[PDB]
């Protein structure tokens, strides 16, 4: 029973256009509730889920300060990083950061996050002990020295165990009728002849929340690990997710195959067959 | 040493004149602050800067930030309400959820006047120990009075045999209006130094109370009150 509060930011330098672009988003579990886009009339943190619009003007005015402060940081970071890696100011580059908190079934902080990536590659990240950093490269080991010197981690640990967990608790309460009520998948099997010797079985899982699901095929009680197709879990667009898995089978031997669905919205696991 | 430095420490100017307050910090911090503190002793934020950018906020007050280590305050058309101690501050960063303690400069005490005619240097006097308590205690207490000065920009210090002493000394925290209910009252300041009697009965021990007055940068016959030191003295007796 895990819940999480996460922020993700993408900073992209645009040489030749002259100004960088910052896009920030925040999720509670698998539900996006805020966004910030610096390419707008005069950028503001806006709501993207109903359980957060009920918050007042001093929330929105505070989260906008927080975003713009973080954009100022990402703006310095992009130039500094060009320095560290010895690059021209002619290429376009990308900064990514992510921070937040997991709340366990213990009511306590399970895991905390503070990590960055430069040009798709890891740069620096908080260790799961929440005391030390993991720096991928020489350049990053700079930042590591600077951050161990001002002792930034204790400061950030205090945010995670404090204001972060409590916001997560407040959001979970405001949004309880969507965020704490799992939606079980609707499931069915479909049959599509490939030849007169083979056929396709496709197991569907539709309309579920949260996004974590296990969908597998078995032939006579054993799991198929080769010859199967799984599309990655995808959003419907309405707050729910879909997935399917498909297996190719000998004609007439379809009833030997079972699909197995595990999901937090199910009382217990589901086992289903193609129903003619 | 590393700290927020601020200049000047005292300032007296005429209304309508223009002035510059300058603040400097070599701590590596990116966020800088200016605070106003009126006579009713409440700190009000004025400006917040971060990496050379306005974050928070008249255009009589025009902050300038040439670089990240300096946030300077350039003031135009001085008025009577501008009188306060201006504190400059800085932070490692503006928070983005976590928070940073602020470090404060020593302040600039600014007084604006309708005209200099009210600015007066202090008269300073020394009051030797009473021989009565030397009987009862074997210790000797000297009182220093600095009176009749304006503005309240003064530093009192004790000197024994030519060098400054911090021992046996108690000075009033701040100068007080001689007559607190009047607009043109002057200020007084008091202090006392206490040694043991053997130290005092020696005619070679030389005591000097010194007030540093910060005044002017004037048709009258009386000389004008420019920054100056005024002192009064006594030698050991009995």
């Amino acid at each position: 029973g895990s819940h999480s509060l996460r922020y993700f930011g993408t900073a992209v330098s645009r040489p030749g256009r002259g100004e960088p672009r910052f896009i920030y988003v925040g999720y509670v579990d698998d539900t996006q509730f805020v966004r910030f886009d610096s390419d707008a009339a005069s950028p503001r943190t806006e709501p993207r889920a109903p359980w957060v619009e009920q918050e007042g003007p001093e929330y929105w005015e505070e989260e906008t300060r927080r975003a713009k402060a973080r954009a100022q940081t990402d703006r310095a970071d992009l130039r500094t990083l060009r320095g560290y890696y010895n690059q021209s100011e002619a290429g376009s580059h990308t900064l990514q950061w992510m921070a937040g908190c997991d709340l366990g079934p213990n009511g306590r902080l399970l895991r905390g996050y503070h990590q960055s990536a430069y040009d798709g590659k890891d740069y620096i990240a908080l260790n799961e002990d929440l005391r030390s950093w993991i720096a991928a490269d020489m350049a990053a080991q700079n930042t590591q020295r600077k951050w161990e010197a001002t002792r930034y981690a204790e400061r950030f640990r205090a945010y995670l165990e404090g204001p972060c967990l409590e916001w997560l608790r407040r959001y979970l309460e405001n949004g309880k009728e969507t965020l704490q009520h799992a939606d079980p998948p609707k499931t069915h099997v479909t049959h599509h002849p490939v030849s007169d010797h083979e056929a396709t079985l496709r197991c569907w899982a539709l309309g579920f929340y949260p996004a974590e699901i296990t969908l597998t095929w078995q032939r006579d009680g054993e799991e198929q690990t080769q010859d199967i197709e799984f599309v990655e879990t995808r959003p419907a667009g309405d707050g729910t997710f879909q997935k399917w898995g498909a297996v190719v089978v000998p004609s007439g031997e379809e009833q030997r195959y079972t699909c197995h669905v595990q999901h937090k919205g199910l009382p217990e696991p589901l086992t289903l067959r193609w129903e003619p | 040493d590393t700290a927020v430095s601020q200049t000047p420490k005292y300032l007296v100017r005429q209304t309508g004149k223009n002035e510059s307050l300058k603040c400097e910090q070599n701590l590596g911090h990116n966020a800088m602050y200016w605070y106003k503190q009126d006579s009713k002793k409440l700190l009000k934020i004025m400006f917040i800067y971060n990496n050379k950018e306005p974050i928070l906020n008249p255009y009589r007050f025009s902050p300038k930030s040439p670089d990240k280590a300096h946030l300077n305050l350039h003031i135009k058309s001085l008025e009577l309400g501008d009188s306060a101690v201006y504190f400059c501050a800085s932070s490692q960063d503006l928070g983005a959820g976590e928070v940073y303690e602020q470090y404060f400069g020593p302040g600039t005490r600014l007084t604006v006047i309708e005209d200099l005619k009210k600015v007066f240097p202090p008269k300073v006097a020394v009051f030797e120990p009473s021989e009565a308590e030397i009987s009862h205690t074997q210790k000797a207490t000297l009182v220093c009075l600095a009176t009749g000065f304006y503005p309240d920009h003064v530093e009192l210090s004790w000197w024994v045999n030519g060098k400054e002493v911090h021992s046996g000394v108690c000075t009033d925290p701040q100068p007080l209006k001689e007559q607190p209910a009047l607009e043109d009252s002057r200020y007084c300041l008091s202090s006392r130094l206490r040694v043991s009697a053997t130290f005092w009965h020696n005619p070679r021990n030389h005591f000097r109370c010194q007030v540093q007055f910060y005044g002017l940068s004037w048709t009258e016959d009386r000389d004008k009150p420019i920054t100056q030191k005024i002192s009064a003295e006594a030698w050991g007796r009995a």
Binding site: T73, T80, L81, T143, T150, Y152, F156 | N30, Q92, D93
Partner: peptide, 4 residues
């Protein structure tokens, strides 16, 4: 808030 920390800068790289």
């Amino acid at each position: 808030g920390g800068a790289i």
